[PDB]
Amino acid sequence: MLKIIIPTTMLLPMTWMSKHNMIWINATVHSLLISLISLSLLNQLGENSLNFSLTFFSDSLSAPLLVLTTWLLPLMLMASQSHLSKETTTRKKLYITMLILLQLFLIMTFTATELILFYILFEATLVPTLIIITRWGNQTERLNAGLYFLFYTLAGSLPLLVALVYIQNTTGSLNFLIIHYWSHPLSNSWSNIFMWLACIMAFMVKMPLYGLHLWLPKAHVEAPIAGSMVLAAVLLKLGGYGMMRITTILNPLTNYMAYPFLMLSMWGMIMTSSICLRQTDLKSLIAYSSVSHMALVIVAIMIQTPWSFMGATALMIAHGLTSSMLFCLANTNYERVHSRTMILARGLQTLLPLMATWWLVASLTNLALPPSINLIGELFIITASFSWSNITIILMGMNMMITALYSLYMLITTQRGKYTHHINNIKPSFTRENALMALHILPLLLLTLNPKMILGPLY
Amino acid sequence: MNPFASLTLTTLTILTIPIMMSNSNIYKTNLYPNYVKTTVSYAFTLSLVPLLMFMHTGQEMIISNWHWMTLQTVELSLSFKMDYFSVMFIPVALFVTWSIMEFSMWYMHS
Amino acid sequence: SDAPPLTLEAIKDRVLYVLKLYDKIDPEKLSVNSHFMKDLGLDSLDQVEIIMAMEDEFGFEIPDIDAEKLMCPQEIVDYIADKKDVYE
Amino acid sequence: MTLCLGAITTLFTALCAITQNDIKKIVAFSTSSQLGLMMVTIGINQPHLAFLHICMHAFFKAMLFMCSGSIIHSLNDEQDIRKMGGLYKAMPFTTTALIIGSLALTGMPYLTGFYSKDLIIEAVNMSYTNAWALLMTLIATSLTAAYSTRIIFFAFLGKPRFPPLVLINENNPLLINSIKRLLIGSIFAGFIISNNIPPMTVPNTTMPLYMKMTALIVTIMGFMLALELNNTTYYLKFKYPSQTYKFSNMLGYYPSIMHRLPTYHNLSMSQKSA
Amino acid sequence: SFPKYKPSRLATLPATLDPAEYDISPETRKAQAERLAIRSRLKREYLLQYNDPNRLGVIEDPALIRWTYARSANIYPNFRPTPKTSLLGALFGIGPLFFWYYVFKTDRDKKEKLIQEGKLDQTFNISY
Amino acid sequence: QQERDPWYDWDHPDLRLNWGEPIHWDLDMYIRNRVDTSPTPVSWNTMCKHLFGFVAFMLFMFWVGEIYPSYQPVGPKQYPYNDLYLERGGDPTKEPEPVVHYEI
Amino acid sequence: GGVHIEPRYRQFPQLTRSQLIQAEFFSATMWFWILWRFWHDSDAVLGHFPYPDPSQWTDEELGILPDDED
Amino acid sequence: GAHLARRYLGDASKEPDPLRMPTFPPDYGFPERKEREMVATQQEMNDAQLMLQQRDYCAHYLIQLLKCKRDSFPNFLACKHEQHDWDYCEHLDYVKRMKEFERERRLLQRKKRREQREAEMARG
Amino acid sequence: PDSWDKDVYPEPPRRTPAPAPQTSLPNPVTYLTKIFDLLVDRPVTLAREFIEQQHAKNRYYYYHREFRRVPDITECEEKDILCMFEAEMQWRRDYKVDQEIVNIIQERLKACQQREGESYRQNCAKELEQFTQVSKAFQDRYSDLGAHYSARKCLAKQKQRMLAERKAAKEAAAA
Amino acid sequence: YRHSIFAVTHVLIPVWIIHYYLKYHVTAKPYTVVERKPRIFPGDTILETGEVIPLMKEFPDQH
Amino acid sequence: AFSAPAAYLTHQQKVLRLYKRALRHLESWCVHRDKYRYFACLMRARFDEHKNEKDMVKATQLLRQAEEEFWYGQHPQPYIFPESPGGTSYERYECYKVPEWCLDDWHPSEKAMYPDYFAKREQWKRLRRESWEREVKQLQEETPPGGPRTEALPPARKEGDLPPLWWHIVTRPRERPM
Amino acid sequence: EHGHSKMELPDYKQWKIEGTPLETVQEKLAARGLRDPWGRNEAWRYSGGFANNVSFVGALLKGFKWGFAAFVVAVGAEYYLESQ
Ligand SMILES: CCCCCCCC/C=C\CCCCCCCC(=O)O[C@H](COC(=O)CCCCCCC/C=C/CCCCCCCC)COP(=O)(O)OCCN
Numbered sequence A: 001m002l003k004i005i006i007p008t009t010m011l012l013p014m015t016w017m018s019k020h021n022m023i024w025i026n027a028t029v030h031s032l033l034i035s036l037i038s039l040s041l042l043n044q045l046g047e048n049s050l051n052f053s054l055t056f057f058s059d060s061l062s063a064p065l066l067v068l069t070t071w072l073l074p075l076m077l078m079a080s081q082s083h084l085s086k087e088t089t090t091r092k093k094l095y096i097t098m099l100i101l102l103q104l105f106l107i108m109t110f111t112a113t114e115l116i117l118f119y120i121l122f123e124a125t126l127v128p129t130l131i132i133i134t135r136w137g138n139q140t141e142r143l144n145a146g147l148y149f150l151f152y153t154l155a156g157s158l159p160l161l162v163a164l165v166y167i168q169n170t171t172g173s174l175n176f177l178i179i180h181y182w183s184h185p186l187s188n189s190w191s192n193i194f195m196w197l198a199c200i201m202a203f204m205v206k207m208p209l210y211g212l213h214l215w216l217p218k219a220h221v222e223a224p225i226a227g228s229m230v231l232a233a234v235l236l237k238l239g240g241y242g243m244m245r246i247t248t249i250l251n252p253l254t255n256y257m258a259y260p261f262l263m264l265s266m267w268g269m270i271m272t273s274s275i276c277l278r279q280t281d282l283k284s285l286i287a288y289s290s291v292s293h294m295a296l297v298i299v300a301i302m303i304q305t306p307w308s309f310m311g312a313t314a315l316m317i318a319h320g321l322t323s324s325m326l327f328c329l330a331n332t333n334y335e336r337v338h339s340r341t342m343i344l345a346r347g348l349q350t351l352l353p354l355m356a357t358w359w360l361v362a363s364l365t366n367l368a369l370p371p372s373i374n375l376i377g378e379l380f381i382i383t384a385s386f387s388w389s390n391i392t393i394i395l396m397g398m399n400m401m402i403t404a405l406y407s408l409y410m411l412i413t414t415q416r417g418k419y420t421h422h423i424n425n426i427k428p429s430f431t432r433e434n435a436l437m438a439l440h441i442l443p444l445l446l447l448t449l450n451p452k453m454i455l456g457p458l459y
Numbered sequence B: 001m002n003p004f005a006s007l008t009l010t011t012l013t014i015l016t017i018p019i020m021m022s023n024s025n026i027y028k029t030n031l032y033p034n035y036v037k038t039t040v041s042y043a044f045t046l047s048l049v050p051l052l053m054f055m056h057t058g059q060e061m062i063i064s065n066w067h068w069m070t071l072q073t074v075e076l077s078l079s080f081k082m083d084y085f086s087v088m089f090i091p092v093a094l095f096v097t098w099s100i101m102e103f104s105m106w107y108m109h110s
Numbered sequence C: 001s002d003a004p005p006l007t008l009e010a011i012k013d014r015v016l017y018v019l020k021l022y023d024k025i026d027p028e029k030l031s032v033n034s035h036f037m038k039d040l041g042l043d044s045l046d047q048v049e050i051i052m053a054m055e056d057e058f059g060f061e062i063p064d065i066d067a068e069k070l071m072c073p074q075e076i077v078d079y080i081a082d083k084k085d086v087y088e
Numbered sequence D: 001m002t003l004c005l006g007a008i009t010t011l012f013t014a015l016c017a018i019t020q021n022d023i024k025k026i027v028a029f030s031t032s033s034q035l036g037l038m039m040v041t042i043g044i045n046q047p048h049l050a051f052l053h054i055c056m057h058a059f060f061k062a063m064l065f066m067c068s069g070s071i072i073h074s075l076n077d078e079q080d081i082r083k084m085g086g087l088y089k090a091m092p093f094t095t096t097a098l099i100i101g102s103l104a105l106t107g108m109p110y111l112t113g114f115y116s117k118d119l120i121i122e123a124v125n126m127s128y129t130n131a132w133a134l135l136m137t138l139i140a141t142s143l144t145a146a147y148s149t150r151i152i153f154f155a156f157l158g159k160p161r162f163p164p165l166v167l168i169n170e171n172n173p174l175l176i177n178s179i180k181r182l183l184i185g186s187i188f189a190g191f192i193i194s195n196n197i198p199p200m201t202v203p204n205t206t207m208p209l210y211m212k213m214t215a216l217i218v219t220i221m222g223f224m225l226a227l228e229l230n231n232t233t234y235y236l237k238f239k240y241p242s243q244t245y246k247f248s249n250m251l252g253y254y255p256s257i258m259h260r261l262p263t264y265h266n267l268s269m270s271q272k273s274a
Numbered sequence E: 001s002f003p004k005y006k007p008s009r010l011a012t013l014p015a016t017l018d019p020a021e022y023d024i025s026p027e028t029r030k031a032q033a034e035r036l037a038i039r040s041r042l043k044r045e046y047l048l049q050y051n052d053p054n055r056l057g058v059i060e061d062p063a064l065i066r067w068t069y070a071r072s073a074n075i076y077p078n079f080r081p082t083p084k085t086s087l088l089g090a091l092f093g094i095g096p097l098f099f100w101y102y103v104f105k106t107d108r109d110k111k112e113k114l115i116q117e118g119k120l121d122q123t124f125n126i127s128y
Numbered sequence F: 001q002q003e004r005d006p007w008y009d010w011d012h013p014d015l016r017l018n019w020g021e022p023i024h025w026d027l028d029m030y031i032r033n034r035v036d037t038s039p040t041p042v043s044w045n046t047m048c049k050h051l052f053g054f055v056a057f058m059l060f061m062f063w064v065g066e067i068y069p070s071y072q073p074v075g076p077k078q079y080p081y082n083d084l085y086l087e088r089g090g091d092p093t094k095e096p097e098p099v100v101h102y103e104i
Numbered sequence G: 001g002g003v004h005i006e007p008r009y010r011q012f013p014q015l016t017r018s019q020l021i022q023a024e025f026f027s028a029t030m031w032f033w034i035l036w037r038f039w040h041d042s043d044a045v046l047g048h049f050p051y052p053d054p055s056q057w058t059d060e061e062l063g064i065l066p067d068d069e070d
Numbered sequence H: 001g002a003h004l005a006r007r008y009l010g011d012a013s014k015e016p017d018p019l020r021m022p023t024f025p026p027d028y029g030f031p032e033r034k035e036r037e038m039v040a041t042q043q044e045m046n047d048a049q050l051m052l053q054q055r056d057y058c059a060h061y062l063i064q065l066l067k068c069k070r071d072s073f074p075n076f077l078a079c080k081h082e083q084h085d086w087d088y089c090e091h092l093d094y095v096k097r098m099k100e101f102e103r104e105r106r107l108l109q110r111k112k113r114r115e116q117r118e119a120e121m122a123r124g
Numbered sequence I: 001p002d003s004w005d006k007d008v009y010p011e012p013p014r015r016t017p018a019p020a021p022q023t024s025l026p027n028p029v030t031y032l033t034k035i036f037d038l039l040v041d042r043p044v045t046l047a048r049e050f051i052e053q054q055h056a057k058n059r060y061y062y063y064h065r066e067f068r069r070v071p072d073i074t075e076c077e078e079k080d081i082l083c084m085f086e087a088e089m090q091w092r093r094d095y096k097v098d099q100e101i102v103n104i105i106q107e108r109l110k111a112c113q114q115r116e117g118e119s120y121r122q123n124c125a126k127e128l129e130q131f132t133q134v135s136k137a138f139q140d141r142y143s144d145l146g147a148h149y150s151a152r153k154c155l156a157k158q159k160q161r162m163l164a165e166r167k168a169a170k171e172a173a174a175a
Numbered sequence J: 001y002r003h004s005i006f007a008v009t010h011v012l013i014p015v016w017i018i019h020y021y022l023k024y025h026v027t028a029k030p031y032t033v034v035e036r037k038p039r040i041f042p043g044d045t046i047l048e049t050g051e052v053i054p055l056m057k058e059f060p061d062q063h
Numbered sequence K: 001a002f003s004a005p006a007a008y009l010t011h012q013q014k015v016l017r018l019y020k021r022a023l024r025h026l027e028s029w030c031v032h033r034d035k036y037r038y039f040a041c042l043m044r045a046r047f048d049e050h051k052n053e054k055d056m057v058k059a060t061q062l063l064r065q066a067e068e069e070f071w072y073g074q075h076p077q078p079y080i081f082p083e084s085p086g087g088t089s090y091e092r093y094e095c096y097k098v099p100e101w102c103l104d105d106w107h108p109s110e111k112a113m114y115p116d117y118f119a120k121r122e123q124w125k126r127l128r129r130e131s132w133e134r135e136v137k138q139l140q141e142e143t144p145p146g147g148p149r150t151e152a153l154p155p156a157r158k159e160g161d162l163p164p165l166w167w168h169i170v171t172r173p174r175e176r177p178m
Numbered sequence L: 001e002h003g004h005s006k007m008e009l010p011d012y013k014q015w016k017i018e019g020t021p022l023e024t025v026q027e028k029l030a031a032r033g034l035r036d037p038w039g040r041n042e043a044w045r046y047s048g049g050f051a052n053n054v055s056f057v058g059a060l061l062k063g064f065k066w067g068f069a070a071f072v073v074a075v076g077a078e079y080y081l082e083s084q
């Protein structure tokens, strides 16, 4: 596992010793090389895991997330290359350093043999993204967004530290292998109920759960493109990964403690989707769609069945890729219009046809069209919920319907109709943006050919 | 062996060639509509044979060729059913589509 | 489509042709520059019916605000030429 | 449930198509009525008959749409039937193709639509099913004949009503060949397919005489009543439309309220509560 | 005399049937004149900014900015806890949750009772 | 937004808005691609009453026809080998109660 | 791929003899087919097997006794 | 159907209900009771594998018709005689069903007449 | 084909009746099939023979991995972690094996249904019975374990099943 | 010439590839390609075994 | 469309519009031409009876009952021309309309094609550049103080002067560009 | 290659209202003292080849004569060949 961590750490001296006009080239090249190296982790076993050492290990659940995290950084660099043109070399190096540190923290977070180390790195990731949002942010509300994003997560995660140290003092270890092998049932007690709440709330606040999702539209609107990319693709999956790992010790309490949350998601995935129908901002619309998808993932995790787990993993990967693509598209529009409103730039398919094709493919992926992995995860979770209770389908069906609607809404308002007359600074699309979209979309349709790589360890 | 399966899969296979050629040079000329129409007509006249074989005997087949994945006890594979309904509806649909595309080569000239 | 590119001469010829089919106005008295209310002594309802006939002849309908101030054949031909973008 | 849904679908769509004025909308409602009839066939447990009707409807409905589109292209993108008159002599091939397609659609015997629709009528009339559904499909067949007559009368028989500039022309080999291929199909394919496929259901060999011809009887009844009603438009009498007629024109007011009441009541909530 | 047309929220009264347009006073004419005057001033300024060859950007529309700000960020500072808002919020945010909870709890309890009683016929139910 | 004047030279012809004019709070609700409040030839209440009556009468008549069905003067269909017991389901080691059909 | 036909301006459009003869030929073919089929296959419309009248059947074959035995 | 009107406008008990038909023993009419015959056996019907609803008393003509259809394939209109025989056998089965319908109808008539006559005799 | 075992995937003789032309008209099916062989089946067979001989020029083998039986969870101490690990791995391998067994039975059932045609309801009773038995066994073994399934949970389920069976048997005997 | 090159490059090559793939790879595994059992009628003969189906029960033929 | 609107609608203009709309809907009702002509002359006969009415009160009371009666008998599916705001091809070609300014972004390789067109385009650009500078001053000196009272534009009055705000009216894409 | 032939219009005096239903229309109009102002405009609609109409039954019965003759010939040949 060190063969991935060490080059990521070496990315920092490379960036700081690079020429004043070559930082982007070397950063992108070596990030892509690190992604190629990390591709080896996909080789998994039907047995326990690949236990590299006493400190790190990999699984069929950590492997897709690690590969996605390593693949993200070149895309973030290409996205951030444009709007940082008038920046001093030292500050560009600081920005690249923040991105590299965030990737390193996520890489060592997703392996994490021991729960306290996982918590340490999972809380360490809060700093680079907070600095990115509050420093390289366009609007004056970036400070409030940073405060919200920091304090929601810290309030959720502070009881988790107490719960984890209490676990280590009682059972004796926090190593995940020993935790799984020496697992014992949880008695129905008030102490155990608060134990469950402390262990669960920290991850459920970052998914985000409906009603605890107020921070996400703010942190998405006020962040730069790289911040929105990283927080929509991987940083949302930290909560899902945490719940998937930690639920092994919460049984059989979860059978009846999950009821308040399931409802909050089952209704919430509807409500936010309806919110997407009436939105004047592209970024807010995509943020609310992300909230809906992550609510469905929460339902899948709380159901706690094999099909639920595989569907949740596939949905996490697919949602990350699609959300990053959509935010790239929105940022490309913003860099031309500088407005970030839906109704100003209209009829863009007349002006940018290939970008219209990219919009169509992104919307179709978000619409969960077969045989894309989005639909694979969605269908697996829907079937598992149907087995959980035959009535759930109703809500599920409604959400699916509404989903398609708003997706096509986002496709029709921005690309069809009559172009706005007074916007004439719509330059033809660069090769950089088109390459970014192609590198976003081709992995999705390639993963569609081999779903077993993203179906988790329960495949 | 058993040309039923080969021809039934060949019709669908050759129906997709102009989609792959959509990035080639023929897509940038005015001969593409005739190319697609000719491909459709060839597909129809090729598909006419399995229907004849069924009419003579009553041949029915399932072709499970590509195994997509396996989910515990469930197995999802690329399977085509070529019973009476399929081998009868394919020629009719291809004939109708050929007529429609020949008409559209006139209707949508501008 | 296969629609021939009609010209100003064609449009003026059609307008005068339909105007000559109007029995209420004399074929000899009418000119390309002849006014309806004063040079021909017509009514406002006559003008709106003439606009109706032009609309029916040429297949497109003129909005009321534009038609109410279309008082002479030459400006009718000019309006139709501007609307249909005919060169010569 | 399948039988009832098919019956309501076919009658509602035929009722709507009765008074429509756009040719494309009329043929769309005809297709919806045919689909409802196929669902009715599904309801009475006759799947192979429904498949056969699928095959026949393909042919004649495709030809009808092709002829309609040829007329629109010949009349400078004009779709309304009020502004199209005597095309029977101005464009003969389209007229004869539409006539043959309408005959096949209405169940003219020994044509493509005969071998399917006649057997549908026979089987629905000789099964333990709903009486309301049976009445519904009979009225639907009558209305099918009626709107086919409406199309022919208002599109080919009267005096021309298009703008003086005549651009009528069919002399294009592509259109002629495409129409004639499906025309040969709609003449012969029904007989060929019916005589070639193996038997798939127990036939109805013995029928009461009045029930045997009920399809033809309702067909000619619809033809005569529709022709009589369309003949009165020549009269110099102007009367305001009846309440029943208005209901038929606005498609039972289903598109209005169902596209105004629910959507609003959703979107407002999506802004207010959500 | 003919049957009256009753306008509704989703089907408004036609402009030709409004009695208000027939009640004409010099005040109404003055109001319409100043309405068209402000409309003409806005159109003049928009066209002046639009036809200038020097401009190569997006004409900033203050109305659009105001609409977006009012839709997004002007809600809470103008929000006051009232019995109407409190009651509507409590209903729309708590009622559906407890209703779905009751529905699903009843369904799952019935299913569990049937399973314990053994009368469910779960044959071939392998994937869950 | 649908019922606005279609002949005015708006700055935004598709949305039929003018630059600088106040924007409706629910503009995205009426964009001509969504709910519209244009006047209709028939009043709203009359249309609702007519459609509701038509559908309710249709459902009632379908239920009545279910109560009073239509059939033919025939007896039940006769199948040879004990209503085809062996080929319908099977269970060949049970010897069901034989059923013989009446020849007339 | 067709020929040149100019507009007419209130004059009936010229019709190529080819389309005339093709339309007439196909109408004649349709009518000939209908007539031939009705001649050869008349039972497809008028039926083949007569419908028996149940009331005309005698009580002997229907198992009816003269109302007294049982 | 007329029977529908006679049932739903007249006396419901006057006429039999096809759902529960037959309501009388088969020997109530006459003691002859000849048994209907089958030509095709189980194994050859299963090999011919017509359909479950097509495996009726007329299945031998259907088997012959399928043999003709498979044999003279190119001339799809050769073996018309066998279709005629199959249709004739179906027609015979249908008239047997109508004879059944009439027989139970008149048996119900005579049973009701017996109920009425016995009631009248008891009253007197 | 020797690529698979015939006994694991049993198939019927499927004898086919010889052609018996009744009329003199030549059926186009035979001409079409003969031209199909002449134009497709010969070059394909030639290329396959070429590829097969090329493969024969260089032959090498691969073997099926054998696994030794290890003590299971029922003979494992409470906190002894090594034998627990071995038992868990063995149980997981067994689980995969039973899943493949159920897969084989399901494939058999599907093939029977398609092969027997419209006599499937009577001609596939044996396969239906085998699938019912295997499904019941698999459901008893592995159902309701959860996402975090393990050997101890399966053992606990089996033990409570034996409790139920023993209590019912004692009650019936003492009834 | 265009029609011939079309029939070669658009029909013959795909059918060759499909025939090879189905004949030597798809059929290599069991139950992938499964066929409906051909109908058996009385009086037929079987190529594989050679036995003849006995005729039927000589039904009474009339009309 | 081209004509600037007025602050209000006169009674004469309103009655003309009612006549136009009623005649169109009657034509829609009476399909055949001769019947349409008969009922149209009848409509004109019932229309001009109150032509010579004098007082405003009765005239305003009229044209109101007429509007209500028309609303009741308005033929809920009228005939609409294909390019009309309700026709079958109202905005069919709006997807082929492309602004002129996009030609400023063409690659020099593409600009190599069509050289005469682009030379003329630069000539038009220079003409617009001068005429705009003239037009700003002409409009500010021409406008009444306190803002314009109507959206009507004055024409050019000098020799080399061009009409104010002409660029985006003259350079419309086309009616049917492709 | 398009339609550039310089088409010329007919003369306006050719169209005459008599002989068309517009005659009955103007007679009825004069019966109430009214007159059509646009009657001659649509007269071309009834003048040329459009002056002749076809009934619905005739339209349906478009090619029955030739088909009936062909059927007679075919059935005669069939009768003379089968009776051999
Ligand atoms: C978005 C903000 C969310 C913030 C997190 C919300 C969840 C809060 C979790 C509860 C807080 C305390 C957790 C304690 C850590 C777990 C350790 C544990 O469970 O051990 C228990 C100890 O349990 C406790 O002491 C918990 C007492 C709670 C004290 C603090 C109360 C905080 C507020 C509680 C209500 C809110 C919780 C849910 C909020 C939902 C989010 C809004 C047993 O200890 P013993 O005494 O040794 O065993 C007794 C037998 N000899």
Ligand SMILES: CCCCCCCCCCCC(=O)SCCNC(=O)CCNC(=O)[C@H](O)C(C)(C)COP(=O)(O)O
Binding pocket: C043, C044, C045, C046, K011, K012, K015, K016, K022, K023, K025, K026, K046, K047, K048, K050, K051, K052, K053, K054, K058, K059, K060, K062, K063, K066, K067, K069, K070, K073, K074
């Ligand atoms: C099916 C549709 C039914 C609709 C029927 C509607 C009812 C129609 C009857 C309406 C009756 C009236 O006119 S209501 C009568 C209202 N009062 C007047 O008309 C008095 C002065 N008339 C004018 O000024 C006009 O414009 C005029 C002088 C005619 C023109 O003038 P010019 O041209 O010189 O400009």
